[PDB]
TrEMBL record:
Family the entry assigns: Belongs to the trehalose phosphatase family.
PANTHER family xrefs: TREHALOSE 6-PHOSPHATE PHOSPHATASE
GO biological process, one term: trehalose biosynthetic process
EC number, UniProt record: 3.1.3.12
Reactions performed catalytically: alpha,alpha-trehalose 6-phosphate + H2O = alpha,alpha-trehalose + phosphate
Cofactor: Mg(2+)
UniProt organism field: Burkholderia pseudomallei (strain K96243)
Broadest EC class assigned to this enzyme: hydrolase
Assigned keywords, A-Z: Hydrolase, Magnesium, Metal-binding
GO MF annotations, alphabetized: metal ion binding; trehalose-phosphatase activity
Protein name: Trehalose 6-phosphate phosphatase
Protein origin, superkingdom: Bacteria
Binding-site positions, Mg(2+): D36, D38, D215, D219
Length: 265
């Protein structure tokens, strides 16, 4: 009785399942761009509060957003408010906290897990943990927590055991997200891949070829969704990855975006 007629997909480029060379140019108005922030567009710093955002970063993101007609999103482990504090690009789509909060292109923000009483109990146990271990840093991120040990590398084992134990106590609601010198505890059932897939179901992203660039383990789920949709996944820096392309550094990734912009306008 009812049918499912599609319009020819606006994507004009498809990447196969193989390693790929980063293209010289992309049809910016038929491409969707998803970027991690720390370690991807900006260098990783000794602590989250110590990152340095060069002026090139907001200029390049905003030019890509103009030339692509809005199909640019940040998909970060930071909160949306933090991303806003560093880029100050009004109305930029942002998935923050690994997908635990998301602002769409209309400017509507959805959050899960904020004010959850279990997170406050987890936070209290981690606060006692970092009290006993100088050099560890507990970062409280709204609905998520980050247990840092970059300045206490000898405490990676105790950080892992504590975070794994607390997550297991609430395994129905929370999940562990390891990263570079950090263990993050975040609501279950949201991730960077799901956030990308949600963007790709909405204008202006829907139907476009997706690009996802990232540097850490959380970003592998973004690479997975970009690859499943025939797009271009870019790992920044060293490490095993499912990304189809790789660049050496934040500066080298920045240089790729700059070339795509120049080739566009
Ligand atoms: Cl993720
Ligand atoms: Mg990162």
């Amino acid at each position: 009785r009812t049918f499912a007629r599609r319009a020819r997909p606006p994507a004009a480029i498809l990447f196969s399942e193989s390693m790929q060379s980063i293209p010289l140019s992309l049809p910016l108005s038929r491409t969707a761009f998803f970027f991690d922030f720390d370690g991807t567009l900006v260098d990783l710093a000794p602590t989250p509060d110590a990152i340095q955002v060069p002026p090139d970063v907001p200029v390049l993101v905003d030019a890509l957003r103009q030339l692509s007609h809005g199909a640019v999103a940040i998909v970060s482990g930071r909160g949306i408010d933090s991303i806003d504090a560093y880029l100050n690009l009004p109305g930029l789509p942002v998935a923050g906290l690994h997908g635990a909060e998301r602002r769409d292109a209309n400017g509507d923000t959805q959050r899960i897990g904020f004010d959850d009483p279990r997170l406050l109990r987890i936070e209290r146990e981690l606060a006692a943990l970092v009290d006993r271990h100088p050099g560890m840093l507990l970062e409280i991120k709204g609905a998520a927590l980050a247990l840092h040990f970059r300045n206490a590398p000898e405490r990676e084992g105790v950080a892992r055991a504590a975070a794994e134990r607390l997550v297991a106590d609430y395994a129905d609601a929370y999940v562990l997200q390891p990263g570079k010198m950090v263990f993050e505890i975040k609501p279950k059932g949201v991730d960077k891949g799901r956030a990308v897939a949600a963007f790709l179901n909405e204008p202006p992203f829907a139907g476009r070829m997706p690009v996802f660039a990232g540097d850490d383990l959380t970003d592998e789920q973004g690479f997975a969704v970009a690859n499943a949709n025939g797009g271009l996944s870019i790992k920044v820096g060293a490490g095993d990855t499912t990304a189809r392309a790789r660049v050496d550094s934040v500066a080298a990734l920045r240089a790729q975006l700059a070339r795509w912009i120049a080739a566009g306008r």
